[PDB]
Amino acid sequence: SSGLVPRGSGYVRLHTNKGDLNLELHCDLTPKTCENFIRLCKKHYYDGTIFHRSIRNFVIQGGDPTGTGTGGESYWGKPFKDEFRPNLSHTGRGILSMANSGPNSNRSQFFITFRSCAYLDKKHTIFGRVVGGFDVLTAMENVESDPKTDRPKEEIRIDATTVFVDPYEEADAQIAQERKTQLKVAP
């Protein structure tokens, strides 16, 4: 079927109330997952959303516009496939991966790791990593959470998201051009 092939890695800044986090996305390796996250960011899907789950030395998770822990939708509506890759593992701090409810059930929620966690490999799609704002990630980790719910006690919030490198531009441009041409001369 029709698809949108990325060209290179993507880059997204999360403007949080604790400062700015820069993410590098492995779009060539995880094209569906990168496309989902980029298109959701571009349409302001994450504006005002919180990190609803924070576990020290483990992960911090957000991307749920309902704030409940179980909400959100992919860009396309339906839950979409995992994209596990042998050269992407949860090794080191700041790995960016998708939350899910079982195999091939990705929607909008994502997490960032605080340390290596091999157990997560081949369970959650890794699609990027933090490359800037490590001090901000630390500040986030340091916010106390309710031990019963893992919800941060003071709100950690994404105010805005800037996609500063969108690797789908060339794909989108070809499709838009071809559609425009077809409408103009072969309706």
Residue numbers in the entry: 271 to 457
Which passages does the manuscript contain on this structure?
Cyclophilins are peptidyl-prolyl isomerases (PPIases: EC 5.2.1.8) and are characterized by their ability to catalyze the interconversion of cis and trans isomers of proline. The active site of the cyclophilin family includes the invariant catalytic arginine (Arg55) and a highly conserved mixture of hydrophobic, aromatic, and polar residues including Phe60, Met61, Gln63, Ala101, Phe113, Trp121, Leu122, and His126.
No binding was detected for PPIL2, PPIL6, or SDCCAG-10, making these, to our knowledge, the first set of human cyclophilins that have been found incompetent to ligate cyclosporin. Three cyclophilins neither bound cyclosporin nor tetrapeptide: PPIL2, PPIL6, and SDCCAG-10. Perhaps more importantly they are, along with PPIL4, the only isoforms that substitute the residue Trp121 with a non-histidine residue. There are no mutational or computational data for the human cyclophilins that have a tyrosine or glutamic acid substitution at the Trp121 position; we therefore made a set of mutants to both PPIA (mutating Trp121 to either tyrosine or glutamic acid) and to PPIL2 (mutating Tyr389 to either tryptophan or histidine). More importantly, the single mutation of Tyr389 to tryptophan converted PPIL2 to an active isomerase, thereby illustrating the fundamental importance of this residue in conferring activity to the cyclophilin family. However, the Tyr389 mutation to histidine did not lead to activity as measured by NMR under the experimental conditions assayed. For this reason, both the Tyr389 mutants were tested for CsA binding using ITC, and both the Tyr389Trp and Tyr389His mutants were found to bind CsA with micromolar affinity (1.6 µM and 6.6 µM for Trp and His respectively). Conversely, a tyrosine modeled in the conformation to coordinate with CsA created a steric clash with the carbonyl of MLE9 (1.75 Å); in addition, there was a close steric conflict with the modeled Tyr residue and Cζ of the highly conserved Phe60 residue that helps form the proline-binding pocket. Perhaps this is why in our apo PPIL2 structure the tyrosine at this position pointed away from the active surface. For PPIL2 and SDCCAG-10, both of which have been found associated with spliceosomal complexes, it may be that it is the non-active surface of the PPIase domain that performs the major function as in the cases of PPIH and PPIL1.
